[PDB]
Design an enzyme around this catalytic site. Structure first.
Site, PDB file in Angstrom:
ATOM      1  CB  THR A  78      28.758 -17.131  14.360  1.00 48.22           C
ATOM      2  OG1 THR A  78      27.507 -17.569  14.747  1.00 48.22           O
ATOM      3  CG2 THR A  78      28.927 -16.522  12.932  1.00 48.22           C
TER       4      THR A  78
ATOM      5  CG  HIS B  27      22.671 -15.632  16.450  1.00 50.76           C
ATOM      6  ND1 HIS B  27      23.493 -16.276  17.245  1.00 50.76           N
ATOM      7  CD2 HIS B  27      22.625 -16.306  15.284  1.00 50.76           C
ATOM      8  CE1 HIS B  27      23.918 -17.346  16.600  1.00 50.76           C
ATOM      9  NE2 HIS B  27      23.413 -17.397  15.379  1.00 50.76           N
TER      10      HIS B  27
ATOM     11  CG  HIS C  17      20.340 -21.059  14.708  1.00 49.65           C
ATOM     12  ND1 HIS C  17      20.969 -21.932  13.828  1.00 49.65           N
ATOM     13  CD2 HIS C  17      21.153 -19.994  14.879  1.00 49.65           C
ATOM     14  CE1 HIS C  17      22.129 -21.340  13.471  1.00 49.65           C
ATOM     15  NE2 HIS C  17      22.210 -20.202  14.111  1.00 49.65           N
TER      16      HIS C  17
ATOM     17  CG  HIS D 207      22.604 -17.564  11.266  1.00 53.78           C
ATOM     18  ND1 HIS D 207      23.511 -17.507  12.334  1.00 53.78           N
ATOM     19  CD2 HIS D 207      22.689 -16.392  10.583  1.00 53.78           C
ATOM     20  CE1 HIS D 207      24.108 -16.293  12.298  1.00 53.78           C
ATOM     21  NE2 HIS D 207      23.579 -15.595  11.243  1.00 53.78           N
TER      22      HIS D 207
ATOM     23  CD  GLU E  82      26.006 -14.642  15.361  1.00 58.82           C
ATOM     24  OE1 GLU E  82      26.006 -15.472  14.447  1.00 58.82           O
ATOM     25  OE2 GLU E  82      26.546 -14.851  16.494  1.00 58.82           O
TER      26      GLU E  82
ATOM     27  CG  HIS F 152      24.021 -22.467  21.641  1.00 58.43           C
ATOM     28  ND1 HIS F 152      24.456 -23.683  22.056  1.00 58.43           N
ATOM     29  CD2 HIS F 152      23.932 -22.481  20.298  1.00 58.43           C
ATOM     30  CE1 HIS F 152      24.567 -24.451  20.954  1.00 58.43           C
ATOM     31  NE2 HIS F 152      24.308 -23.731  19.879  1.00 58.43           N
TER      32      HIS F 152
HETATM   33 ZN    ZN Z   1      23.794 -18.706  13.880  1.00 57.16          ZN
END
Ligand code: ZN
Ligand code: HG
EC number: 4.2.1.1
Length: 259
Positions: free
Chosen positions: A197, A95, A93, A118, A105, A63
């Site tokens: 999240t 996004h 990590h 994050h 996000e 992911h």
């Molecule tokens: Zn995250």
């Protein structure tokens, strides 16, 4: 669904069927309305002590890709800000999006950034990560937005190892990476009580979102988009748009450390 992900059939709008807390009272991310955030002069400056950080490995978990740190002792910690106690970094990590106009996000006045980093920390009073996520003040996540502009030198070691963890389940040794190279110059922030999240979406997070984005080059973010959601020998699905949209604020106030 089947297993959750970011596709049309198993994406964020489906999560609530396996994870009912998705429709909870303290879900993340949120939009940060800058004119409604309350300056709170009682908030202390953050204290980021990452000089003794030990990175260990980088992993494609299907992911995102996580860089993991040794959290068996107080080596890389966050304290101060709105936090009580010491929180140890466990992993970071990102996004990101399929295009530069999306990917983050959190949004700021509805503005979306190209990506969001994050840095995940857990409260040492709980002894381990798995116990921390069951507590309302168990984690602290520092979120940093990325905009496309100049290259970020300190991100290049990450970018370069991505070819070796292209597919789900692959990992690579990743020692001696210093996460200080990923911080903006200013540590001014917004804070609010929220959740993870991704599933399991637990409401155990104090979010600390930095006002100042970092810049990354187009080439750098392009390399993120070459990763795959799938495992080796499965049909290729590029790892893009792995971000959850903004959730309702409900009964929460966003506080600012600055005016
Ligand atoms: Zn995250
Ligand atoms: Hg929790």
């Amino acid at each position: 669904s089947h297993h959750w992900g970011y596709g049309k059939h198993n994406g964020p709008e489906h999560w609530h069927k396996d994870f009912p807390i998705a429709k909870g009272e303290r879900q993340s991310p949120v939009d940060i309305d800058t004119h409604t955030a309350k300056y709170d002069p009682s908030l202390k400056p953050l204290s980021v002590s990452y000089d003794q950080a030990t990175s260990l490995r980088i992993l494609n978990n299907g992911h995102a890709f996580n860089v993991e740190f040794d959290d068996s002792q107080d080596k890389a910690v966050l304290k101060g800000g709105p936090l009580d106690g010491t929180y140890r970094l466990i992993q970071f990590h990102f996004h990101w999006g399929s295009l530069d106009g999306q990917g983050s996000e959190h949004t700021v006045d509805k503005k979306k950034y190209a990506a969001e980093l994050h840095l995940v920390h857990w409260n040492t009073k709980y002894g381990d990560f798995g116990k921390a996520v069951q507590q309302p003040d168990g984690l602290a996540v520092l979120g940093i937005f990325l905009k496309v502009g100049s290259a970020k030198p300190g991100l290049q070691k990450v970018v370069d190892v991505l070819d070796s963890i292209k597919t789900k389940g692959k990992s690579a040794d990743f020692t001696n990476f210093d996460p200080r190279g990923l911080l903006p110059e200013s540590l001014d922030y917004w804070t609010y009580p929220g959740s993870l999240t991704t599933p399991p979406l637990l409401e155990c997070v104090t979010w600390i979102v930095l006002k100042e984005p970092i810049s990354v080059s187009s080439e750098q973010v392009l390399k993120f988009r070459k990763l795959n959601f799938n495992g080796e020998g499965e049909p290729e699905e590029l790892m893009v748009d792995n971000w959850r949209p903004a959730q309702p604020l409900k009964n929460r106030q966003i506080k600012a450390s600055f005016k």
